[PDB]
Design a protein around this nucleic acid. Sequence first.
RNA 1: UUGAACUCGCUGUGAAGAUGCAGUGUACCCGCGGCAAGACGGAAAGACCCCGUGAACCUUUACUAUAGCUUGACACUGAAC
Length: 148
Amino acid sequence: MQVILLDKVANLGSLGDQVNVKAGYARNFLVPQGKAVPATKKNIEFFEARRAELEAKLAEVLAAANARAEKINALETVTIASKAGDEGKLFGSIGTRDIADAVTAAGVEVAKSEVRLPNGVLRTTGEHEVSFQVHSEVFAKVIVNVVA
RNA sequence: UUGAACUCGCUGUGAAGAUGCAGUGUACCCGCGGCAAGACGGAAAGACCCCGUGAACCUUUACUAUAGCUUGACACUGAAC
Ligand SMILES: [K+]
Ligand SMILES: [K+]
Ligand SMILES: [K+]
Ligand SMILES: [K+]
Ligand SMILES: [Mg+2]
Ligand SMILES: [Mg+2]
Ligand SMILES: [Mg+2]
Ligand SMILES: [Mg+2]
Ligand SMILES: [Mg+2]
Ligand SMILES: [Mg+2]
Ligand SMILES: [Mg+2]
């Protein structure tokens, strides 16, 4: 299937590229996510005539993501409280939803889909390092302090 | 049940076990109560047996198929290393 990329897609190409991808790749991911469109004559001519504003919007999105990442980094450390045993091990667990809620209460709005926990979901009291992905290329870090 | 009967015995003859043929013996016409030796008695187009290039249902390492079960290829089906 021939498609026109509407953004930067890793291992595929840059915006405006015309690429041949597997039909399922286009059908179930790229088009529904908005990262590409079918390479019909209408689409090709329309995009080529109306192209540059899209890079302007992509730059605006990247700048907004950078600003949000800077705010997240400036937030530094966020503290979450739960219940645990005397050994410091939590009976329950601390996940993306409540981490994002704590960050939002701290001031920066982050969705649960932007939380990236490398070593699974937190289960012990102490300090952990969590990552945030607000853009496909930028990354932020937050210290999480779990207390009883 | 019943082709029609003026519907005896014997010995023979004879699709080869005769009331009905031949020879011969016996016998006046007709009921009623009884008995079942014969009318190859009545009943059911022999069930045994064979035959038909008949039937059915059953069996199986008979033949040919086939549901099911199982194998792989392609499709729905994508990304990275
Ligand atoms: K005579
Ligand atoms: K009799
Ligand atoms: K035969
Ligand atoms: K039968
Ligand atoms: Mg004789
Ligand atoms: Mg005689
Ligand atoms: Mg009498
Ligand atoms: Mg009697
Ligand atoms: Mg008889
Ligand atoms: Mg017969
Ligand atoms: Mg047969």
